[PDB]
Design a protein around this ligand. Sequence first.
Ligand code: OXL
Ligand code: FE
Length: 324
Amino acid sequence: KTVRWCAVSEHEATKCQSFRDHMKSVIPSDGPSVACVKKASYLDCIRAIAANEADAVTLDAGLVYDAYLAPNNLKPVVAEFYGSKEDPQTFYYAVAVVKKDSGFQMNQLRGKKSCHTGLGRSAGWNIPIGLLYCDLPEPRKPLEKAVANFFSGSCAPCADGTDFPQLCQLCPGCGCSTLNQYFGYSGAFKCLKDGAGDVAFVKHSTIFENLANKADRDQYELLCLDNTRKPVDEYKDCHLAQVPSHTVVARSMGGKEDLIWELLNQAQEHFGKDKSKEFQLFSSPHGKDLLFKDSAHGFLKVPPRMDAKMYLGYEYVTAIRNLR
Ligand SMILES: O=C([O-])C(=O)[O-]
Ligand SMILES: [Fe+3]
C-alpha cells in the first residue's frame, strides 16, 4: 500500500517528492510506496493523521507527547537512532551553545537573548525552560509570557507572536517550519551565529553539523549546570539533559504501522547513511533535518502497541509534567 507522509513546508515537500520518486525507481510495483501531503506546521500534520488525511510524520519527543493527548491520541511507531549502526543511540543530549568570552553562566541568563528550536521541543524548550522555571518572574503562567519576560528578546518558533511578541523578536512571526530561517536545531544555531541571540538551546551534534572546521567551533562554548563553561566537544560532561530520540507517529486504528516500518526499513537500506549516490534519507541539498534528522543513522521499530508515555519513559514524562 501507500504511506501518506506529512511534509512541513516547501523544503520538506521537495525532499518528500524525491523520496517518492527514488523509492519508485528501486522498489517493485507491489512494494511500499510513499505519497506526500504538504502542511504548514507539524500541528496540522498531527490533525491530518488523526483525521485519516495522512499517515505518518516524524516528531521531536516533546511533540510526540503532545500528539498522544486527546483528541489526536497518536502513537510512536518507528524511532530514529543516532551515533552509528554499530552503537545505536535512542537518545541525544540537549545543550546550551554560546559564543566564547560572552561573559555569562547558566545562572546569569536573565536578560540575555535566546534562540530556541521551537515551542514544546525537547532540547530547545522543555529541557531548558524546565531548568529555568523557578528563575522566571511571577506570574509564571502562561509560561510563554514568563519566558518572554525573563529574556530580553527571543526566537521561539511556533509561539503566538500576537500574544507573546517578545518571543519572536529574533525571528518575526515565529514561523513553525523551515520557512523561518531560525526554526529547528540549525535555525537556532544560525540565530546565535548571526548575533541575534546570546544562547542557542540545541543538541550536541548541532554545531558540528554547521561548522566543519575546529578552529571555527573553538569560537563557541557550552553552558554547564554547575555554572561553568566547557568546549563544545565536551557535551557529555556539559549538557542540560538526555532526551528520547525523535519518532514517527501514526494512528492507533488503521494506522498502517506495519507498512510504515516496511517502507522505512527498506528505505534505510536503499538510501540510508552512505548507501546511495542518488538519494539520502538523512541529508538533503534542500536543507537540514528535513523529514528526519540529519544526525540520524537509521530506524528501529517501536515495540507492539506502545503508547507515547511508555515510549518516552517516566523520567522525560515527569520532566514535561513538572514544567506544566
Ligand atoms: O529537540 C529539539 O529542540 C528539536 O528537535 O527541535
Ligand atoms: Fe529534538
